[PDB]
């Protein structure tokens, strides 16, 4: 099961700051661009879990496109993994290739492992995000 998301997610400068405040991150590389320059980064760098924004649309959508046998009512987010190959910076264009690595179905409960490879505009990897949904079986 491959799924390539049409269109990219465009990392906003202001949405970065907005998010960092929401998760109580106060590191200057998120708020002032000169500090990002001091750290050695052209634009504002994004908080480590910023992909929860970009990946919101993906996870909602891939459930249907993958036909995962899980009941949304009783589903639970068990595992989150990020391999930051390259830091996410403001004005980054982010493309998503989402794969279904595995499904396990035992008594009552189905455990699904979902991998999204994030690539930039050019097509070089940015972050490898792995999600593990745990839920009540449908079929």
């Amino acid at each position: 099961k491959h799924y390539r998301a049409p269109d990219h997610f465009l990392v906003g400068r202001e949405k970065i700051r907005e998010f960092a405040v929401a998760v109580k991150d106060d590191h200057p590389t998120h708020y002032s661009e000169p500090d990002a320059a001091a750290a050695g980064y052209p634009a504002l760098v994004a908080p480590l879990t910023f992909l929860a924004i970009a990946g919101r649309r993906v996870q909602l959508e891939i459930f249907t496109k993958f036909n995962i046998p899980i009941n949304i009512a009783r589903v639970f987010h068990r595992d989150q993994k990020f391999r930051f190959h390259r830091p996410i910076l403001a004005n980054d264009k982010l493309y998503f290739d989402t794969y279904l690595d595995s499904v396990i179905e035992s008594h009552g409960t189905v455990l699904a492992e979902i991998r999204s490879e994030v690539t930039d505009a050019e097509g070089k990897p940015v972050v490898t995000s792995v999600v593990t949904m745990l839920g009540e079986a449908a079929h």
Partner: protein
Amino acid sequence: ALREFSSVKVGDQLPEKTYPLTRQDLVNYAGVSGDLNPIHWDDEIAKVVGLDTAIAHGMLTMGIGGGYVTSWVGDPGAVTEYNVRFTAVVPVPNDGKGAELVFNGRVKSVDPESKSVTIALTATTGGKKIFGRAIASAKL
């Protein structure tokens, strides 16, 4: 302020920060993230599914953790991996106090050829831990 690899070494306990978390912080995150699940901001919905009060978002708590790690590392762009399993929930009552996340950390691994250092993390609410295996790694 990315710290040099030579400074930190295995066994180094990390300074504990205690993050307060109000019901307003849960509403803000609902909108910022686009996760509008009522269990995180409506109590009566929380109890129907069988909870005491409304709970913090899973990714809010992990997101906070990123701050706790990124500060110590000194550079967000330095962090190479951030992995967390969610074991429990963080209830946040609309009582004008809310709840507190106590974060802790310990370096468990260094690779001197690399600039890699790995931190084991521990987040708690009222003592109960909310994460299982929760680690972070960064190039120093």
